[PDB]
Amino acid sequence: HISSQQHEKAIKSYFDEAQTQGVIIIKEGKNLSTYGNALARANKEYVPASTFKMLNALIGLENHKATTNEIFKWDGKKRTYPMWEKDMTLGEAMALSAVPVYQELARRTGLELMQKEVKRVNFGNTNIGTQVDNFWLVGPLKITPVQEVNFADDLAHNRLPFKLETQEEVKKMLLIKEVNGSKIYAKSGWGMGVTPQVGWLTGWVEQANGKKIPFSLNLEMKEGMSGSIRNEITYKSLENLGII
Ligand SMILES: COC(=O)Nc1ccn2c(N[C@@H](C(=O)O)C(C)(C)S(=O)O)c(C=O)cc2c1
């Protein structure tokens, strides 16, 4: 069938075509595979941006700072996007990347509990600093693409140190696509408050046979670039490798 060389060339071209620099790590069982046009990004640290929402949710639910049915009401103040000017649950906010909701959840958790929980889960460099409501957007919290795909691997298999129910609740919030009997769970991310800007799409594919294949795409976001480029390159890569 297809040679490794051909797969590597195809996926690298997906990043080349988007005129950006990026990498996508795929994990099968315990083996990591790095693809893309800037492989060294694999072990470099970047702010997690919205990918942190996955953990924010885990923490909030576990520590009873919210429930999956609770509706977070829009305070009526102007928001970056009109789509965020509404009342939503944690899951709706996850799908809409509604930062205001997760900033409220972070504030409910509190700096002390948050630092302690991030440390406990051993997420990235585990340092949240002194600002409980923006540490995942502008630092000091950072994480590498390898750590992100491993975090996705752990959540997909319920290995994180949270009740099985909590993990299951959050995973249900991450279904973003179904393709040929395959289900794609993932959370996107875009650190716009950092330079250069980082883009993420972390999650996993659940194949019909029940096997789960974690992944983490990480690239540099540039002005005039569509957020859906993260999704397109991820889907093309996954498909080129026969994952979906
Ligand atoms: C305190 O900062 C602010 O007030 N603003 C913003 C403005 C946009 N933000 C994102 N991006 C989404 C979007 O813009 O549609 C994406 C779906 C592309 S992303 O994949 O989540 C975040 C997720 O990283 C976080 C923010 C914060």
What distance in Å separates the CA atoms of residue 54 and residue 26, rounded to the nearest whole number? Answer: 19
Q: Which residues line ligand 1 (CB under 6 A)?
A: 49-50, 80, 97, 99, 134, 137, 188-190, 192, 227
Q: Give the angle subtended at the CA of 159 by the CAs of 156 and 162, to the nearest 5°.
A: 105
What distance in Å separates the CA atoms of residue 38 and residue 47, rounded to the nearest whole number? Answer: 18
Domains recognised in the chain with CATH numbers: 1-244 (3.40.710.10)
What distance in Å separates the CA atoms of residue 243 and residue 72, rounded to the nearest whole number? Answer: 36
Dist. CA 3 → ligand 1 center (Å): 38
Q: What is the resolution of this structure in A?
A: 2.0
In the chain, which residue ranges form alpha helices assigned H by DSSP?
4-17, 53-62, 90-96, 99-109, 111-121, 135-138, 145-156, 164-172, 228-240
Indicate left, alpha or beta for 129 from its phi (over 0: left) and psi (-120 to 50: alpha): left
Pocket perturbation via mutation, ligand 1, pick of 79, 80, 197 by most ligand atoms within 8 A of CB? 80
What distance in Å separates the CA atoms of residue 195 and residue 193, rounded to the nearest whole number? Answer: 7
- Please identify which residue in the block is written with the tokens 């409910």: 108
Residues 6 or more apart in contact with residue 109 via CB below 8 angstroms? 56, 59, 60, 63, 65, 117, 132
The secondary structure of 85-105 as a DSSP string is SS-B-HHHHHHHT-HHHHHHH
What distance in Å separates the CA atoms of residue 55 and residue 118, rounded to the nearest whole number? Answer: 8
**Cis? peptide before 82, omega within 30° of 0:** no
Q: Which atom of ligand 1 is nearest to the CA of 230?
A: 20
Residue 227 is given by DSSP the state: T
Residues 6 or more apart in contact with residue 208 via CB below 8 angstroms? 181, 182
Listed residue (151, 143, 167) closest to 214, CA to CA: 151
Listed residue (61, 129, 64) closest to 93, CA to CA: 61
DSSP-assigned beta bridge partners for residue 213: 205
What distance in Å separates the CA atoms of residue 142 and residue 124, rounded to the nearest whole number? Answer: 6
What distance in Å separates the CA atoms of residue 216 and residue 34, rounded to the nearest whole number? Answer: 10
> Which tokens in the block code for residue 96?
């809409």
Protein residue with its CA nearest to atom 1 in ligand 1:
134
Kindly give the interhelix angle for 145-156 and 53-62, rounded to the nearest 10 degrees.
40
Q: Please, are residues 52 and 136 in contact by the beta-carbon 8 Å criterion?
A: yes
Query: What amino acid is encoded at 19 in this protein?
Result: Q
Report the structure determination method. X-ray
Question: Which residues belong to the active site?
Answer: 50
Protein residue with its CA nearest to atom 18 in ligand 1:
227
Residue 128 is given by DSSP the state: -
